[PDB]
Amino acid sequence: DIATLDVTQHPYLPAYSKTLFEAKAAKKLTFEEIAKKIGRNEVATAALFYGQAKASPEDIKNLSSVLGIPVAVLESQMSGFPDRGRSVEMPPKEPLIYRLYEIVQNYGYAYKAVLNEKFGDGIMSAISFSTSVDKETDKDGNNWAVITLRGKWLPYSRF
Amino acid sequence: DIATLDVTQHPYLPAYSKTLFEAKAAKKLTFEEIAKKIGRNEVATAALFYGQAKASPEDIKNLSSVLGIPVAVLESQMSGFPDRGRSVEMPPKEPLIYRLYEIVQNYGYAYKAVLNEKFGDGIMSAISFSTSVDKETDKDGNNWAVITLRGKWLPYSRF
Amino acid sequence: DIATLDVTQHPYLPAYSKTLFEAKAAKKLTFEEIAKKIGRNEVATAALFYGQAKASPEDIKNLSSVLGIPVAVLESQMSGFPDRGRSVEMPPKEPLIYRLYEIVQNYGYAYKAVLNEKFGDGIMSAISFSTSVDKETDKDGNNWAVITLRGKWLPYSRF
Amino acid sequence: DIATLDVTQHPYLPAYSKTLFEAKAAKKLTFEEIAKKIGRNEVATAALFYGQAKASPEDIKNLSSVLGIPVAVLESQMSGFPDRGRSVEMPPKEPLIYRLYEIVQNYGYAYKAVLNEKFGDGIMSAISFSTSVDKETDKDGNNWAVITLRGKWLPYSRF
Amino acid sequence: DIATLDVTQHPYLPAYSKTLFEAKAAKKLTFEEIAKKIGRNEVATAALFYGQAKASPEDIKNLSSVLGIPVAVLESQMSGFPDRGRSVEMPPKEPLIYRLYEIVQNYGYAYKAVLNEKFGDGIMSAISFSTSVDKETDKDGNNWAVITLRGKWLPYSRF
Amino acid sequence: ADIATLDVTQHPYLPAYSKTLFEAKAAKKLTFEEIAKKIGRNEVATAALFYGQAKASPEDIKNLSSVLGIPVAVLESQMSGFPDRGRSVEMPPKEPLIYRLYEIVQNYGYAYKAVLNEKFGDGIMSAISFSTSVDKETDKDGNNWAVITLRGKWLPYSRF
Amino acid sequence: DIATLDVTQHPYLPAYSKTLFEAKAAKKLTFEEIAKKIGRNEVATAALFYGQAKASPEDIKNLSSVLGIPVAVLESQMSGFPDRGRSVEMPPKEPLIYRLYEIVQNYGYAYKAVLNEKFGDGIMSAISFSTSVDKETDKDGNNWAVITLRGKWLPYSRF
Amino acid sequence: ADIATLDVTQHPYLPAYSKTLFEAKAAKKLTFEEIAKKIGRNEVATAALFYGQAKASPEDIKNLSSVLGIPVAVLESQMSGFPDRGRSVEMPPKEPLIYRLYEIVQNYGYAYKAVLNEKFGDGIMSAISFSTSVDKETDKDGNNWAVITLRGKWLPYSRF
Amino acid sequence: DIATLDVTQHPYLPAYSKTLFEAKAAKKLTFEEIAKKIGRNEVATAALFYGQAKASPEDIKNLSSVLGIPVAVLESQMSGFPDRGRSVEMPPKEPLIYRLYEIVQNYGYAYKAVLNEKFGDGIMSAISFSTSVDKETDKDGNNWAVITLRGKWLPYSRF
Amino acid sequence: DIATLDVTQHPYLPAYSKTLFEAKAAKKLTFEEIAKKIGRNEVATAALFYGQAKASPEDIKNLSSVLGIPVAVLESQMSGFPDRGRSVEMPPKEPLIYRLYEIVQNYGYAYKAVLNEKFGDGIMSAISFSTSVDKETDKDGNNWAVITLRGKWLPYSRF
């Protein structure tokens, strides 16, 4: 049971999102398999499919191969640079993504306070950054999602 | 350099937020020490101070002792249940917090797709949930903040 | 008189909402009947028609046969995972749905207080959850609608 | 462990909300107890404390005696007619109340379709209406909250 | 000079609004004439054309006859239940409609206060309701529009 | 017995005189019917004035002082100047009764426009050169209905 | 350099806007020449092109003649009544238009106070109204744009 | 005799000096016409200043002190610095008179742009290098009309 | 690696935006080369491509020639006056642009104070205005982007 | 003529903004002077007064001295970390600040294009960043405001 895309309900994504997701659906591939094939993490590979990351030339050749899309089709639809941020309309209505938003809402200042006392005045980068999703089962049989955010600490300049 | 609160700029927190923070600032206490005193994680303790968590009866006694605030004051001001979600006006303006929001915006559907392929149709709980902040220094000497989200997977029911 | 869908006035539903509802109108089926044939409740069945639930493999088969739609059409249209939340533009403008919104608005803190006193600090899940609609005619011949919401109580973690 | 109010974080409730809850907190009363004394349902009683219902003359004498508030103070503050709808800032930020909102959002059209097929063109009233909260414990020791909405069906007129 | 519709500028109406309005234009009919033929009031009839009312089986027949649209086209386009509320983007931009909104704004609490003193705690229904438009010409020769709203008084239940 | 009141803790951004007028209304247990009869303005208009949405004439000020027991100099100062209408209802209206009127506008707006366009041409019904009232109707069955009448001057668009 | 319209960038204008503007572009006509031909001011004439005015039967004939569009085609597209207010998305993003909005913002209460002192309690009509644009060139040869607003004074009724 | 006044209970986020000026304006029964003539600015401009929407020159401060009877030292400390324009009107305007001006921008905006574009080219009419006035005409049928004139400097977009 | 446009994700640009970018993409041209060819600044050139500047008759000729587009296509698509301001939905969601908005957010009043103290009461024009982007490489080999805003000082008039 | 603050019109600044600005007005200090005393630029120094920067310990001693405020008052009011982003309500209403917002709107995608072609996929940092304001005079005697943004280029990571 694999993630698919229906652009009837999901506007403003790049044309290649449809192209990639349609080939993904035809071949019944998971993002884990595609990720492995392109040498990028699962989340980043899915982010790429939603228009939220940039395909290197190697990614383009690797996707063409595993998805069965001719390279020239990807080179022309996946050219230039990502125009990030249109995939999620805020505030999020999708329940799973809403919970992530809720976490920011209820822990924002808590995270800021802790980060500030650990690092000082600055931010955790969302650019010089990686993230991953893991699945875990505990001893009682409960399942847990573990999302890790790892971003570079950037102090505010002094000028 | 410790985290503090000025309610002139930060409205709609509980009255206890000012009472707790004023006392944190006057004792020059870090959230690390307060968290260790109360047996709760740093983020959670910070969250409590911003009105975003509930103090147990033991938390009240322990906060009273380390902050030098009489127990009867905390009991009255920290009674009832938290009314979460007013501390961050959306979209966030504060840069640090904004970066976390941007993460949800740019990765939301990537996260969903990966989580759906690993767990099926459902959510990661923001309720049955924990989070932590850690610091990593890499071999190159640069600092990284690592924020971990860990929430129970809930499938949608069939009914 | 049965419920139908006109996508001219109702955007951002999946393509399959159109496919399903046109077959429903063509056969003159009610949701009560469709529901008995898939093994899901009336409300859930209608939520699935509006893109707000996921069809199991058996749902797709049983829908295929009650609606007269080729199994392969529903398998490509109803693949992957729902992207819930787009079917109602908030605040709701349709009067009936608006009343449910108004109830949230006028009772939401009341519910919270009562739930908090009965269960503690937590939520009633909307994921591990079910709902029904029933009709009652009272002693005096007046009709009432009865919506039941049944959600799992989730306490906040201590961490 | 009872519900309390801190108007610092919860603006635009009537003055009597503060008077009622301060007495409630001082006497350590539950809404269950207060409701029993005034002969009203628990939810309706809590609604009344948030300025979302009107107290009859008997409700005022009874609230006055159970809460130990001089009856003439309540008479001056609880006069007139409620000005409902200000207690919940939309969309709701408090997580418990948000889930009720998300329900409306994900089930709105579903409820409308089922209700239309059972009653015709009209609404479930939110005025000629009652509601309740019950606790169920299923055979596996898991708690569920059950919220019942019961509103009069009103058909649209023909004119 | 009769009312027309151009969907180029008015989105989110049902497909049927175009069909009715095109036939209305083809036969140069006024809403007065159509209303008389279907036995409904002018305002109701116009609302119907904008997707804001339900056509009874008799209305569908009479509409077909007076507009020259085959009864089968109308039955298929006008099936199901109205999804009211999308015709006017709020706040209204069309000046005539804006003035109605300015009245609600400037008189809303006035109407409530006077309604409340006359009827008690409740609402005037917009469901169990009728409305008309009349033209008065005074003795100085000035024309006045008179809009009447007639709604059933509904008191809040005691529960 | 049961009269309209104002609690400014829940209702911000009204003129200071709204509080003053409404507190004297409450003390004296007056209805808007009675106050209207004293000042010579209709019930709805009177209530509107109290919510900051109308301008008291010099006679209004004297008559409100009299009927309300407020010294004239106090109304004179508090009710000087010109109303700044539009702040009493935060849009969209949250109060159910008021929301119902907004719902009417929402669901009948274009129907009204179409009917008024066919009877009067291109223009508007004025909300300025305008009156309104509330009546009660009890039908044969004993059911109670509220009847709100909107009476506004027809203004055609100019031609230039 | 004449004004033209590109509907790719400017949605929700009536279909006739395109029709008129395409002819305007084809014949290289200014709004001055068209205005002169129809016997209306330039601003009015442009307003009409943007769907914000109603053409009389003579306007239709004159437009037809000057633009080379058959009378019947224009009549079929320009009948009924204007549905004003959709051409400018608020707040305006186009800089020229934004400056007029800023004028309203920074002079609104000023204008109201001066109008109130001159005329009393009321409004300047935007309906019984006309407007023009003129060009002045001063001593140093700078151009100034003069916009004149002339609207009927309407006092609030006493009722 | 019926003069504009201000009640800050209902009108937030104006500078402290708005209340100072308007309270003195009310105490002396001054019109903006009279204040404006005393300070040598336009009536509109003078009202805009009272709403915190303009800057008083040092001469303005002296002349306001004198005509309003407020000590010069008070006005200097309150009226110091630079205006922070644009807080006086919550958008969209709910005040009806102000709303009509907003509806004019809405309904005429692209018309004004087209006509301006054809007369002047690619550019704006400034709202900074700008003046405005209010005048009253009375037509042959005794109807009154408000005439608002906006006069702004044309600025072409640069070529770079 | 050049900037391209995909209108699937970027609505409400003029028709010519697509025409110009498609040609830029097919010839693999940078904005620096196009800018050099038409004698305009790089930033100004890219702004023209997104519909935010006016092409002179020479620009239309030079663009047509360097891009390999029929001059008559550009003459007609690039007619009229720009309707600036639709290319960025506010608040910006694209991270790079968002940083510019955050700068305005965090330094706006600081800029205002410093500009006021150096020039008096007025604005920096965004109309008599130029801007540029430059790359700086420091001693440690870190790259910096330097954006210069150069606008005419316009004092407020005295009237 | 120096910049001052009136908190009556400017809410949500830290308490220290009032304290610093009032001292500034009492001493008739310009930001240029205060900046030179603390060893930061004018813009940074003004940002500090509006709550948008953090004072170092030397800044506090220097501010105290040039402004005449007891070091101890500044130490308690200026403790902790800035909570940036509240000083400007978006979109900006103040005309000067609005023009900067209008530049972001009209040049946002242009900057992004040119930045992308010069640096690749990334952002200009607003954290690792400085900015200045300069006054310039041209050949003709015209005054120009020059705002420089200098931010660190951050590429998106590959993960």
Author numbering:
A (entry chain E), B (entry chain F), C (entry chain G), D (entry chain H), E (entry chain A), G (entry chain B), ...: 3 to 161
F (entry chain D), H (entry chain C): 2 to 161
Report text from the authors:
Cyanase (EC 4.2.1.104; also known as cyanate hydratase and cyanate lyase) catalyzes the decomposition of cyanate into ammonium and CO2. We report here the crystal structure of the cyanase from T. lanuginosus (Tl-Cyn) at 2.2 Å resolution. The structure of cyanase contains an N-terminal α-helical domain (residues 1–91; helices H1–H5) and a C-terminal α + β domain (residues 92–161; two antiparallel β-strands S1–S2 and a helix H6). The structure reveals extensive interactions at the subunit interfaces in a dimer, and a decamer is formed by a pentamer of these dimers.
A decamer of Tl-Cyn is formed by a pentamer of these dimers, with intimate contacts among them. The active site of Tl-Cyn is located in the C-terminal domain, at the interface between neighboring dimers of the decamer. This suggests that Tl-Cyn needs to be a decamer to be active. Malonate (Mal) is situated on a two-fold symmetry axis in some of the dimers of the decamer, while two formates (For) are observed in the other dimers. Both Mal and For are present in the Tacsimate solution used to crystallize Tl-Cyn and have good electron density. The carboxylate groups of Mal are recognized by six hydrogen bonds from residues of four monomers, and formate has the same interactions as it has essentially the same binding mode as the carboxylates of malate. Specifically, the carboxylate is hydrogen-bonded to the side chain of Ser127 and the main-chain amide of Ala128 from one monomer. One of the carboxylate oxygen atoms is also hydrogen-bonded to the side chain of Arg101 from another monomer, which is also involved in a bidentate ion-pair with Glu104 from a third monomer. In addition, a unique feature of Tl-Cyn is the Tyr14 residue, which is located in the center of the structure and helps to reduce the size of the central channel. The structure of Tl-Cyn shows substantial differences to that of E. coli cyanase20, even though the two proteins share 40% sequence identity.
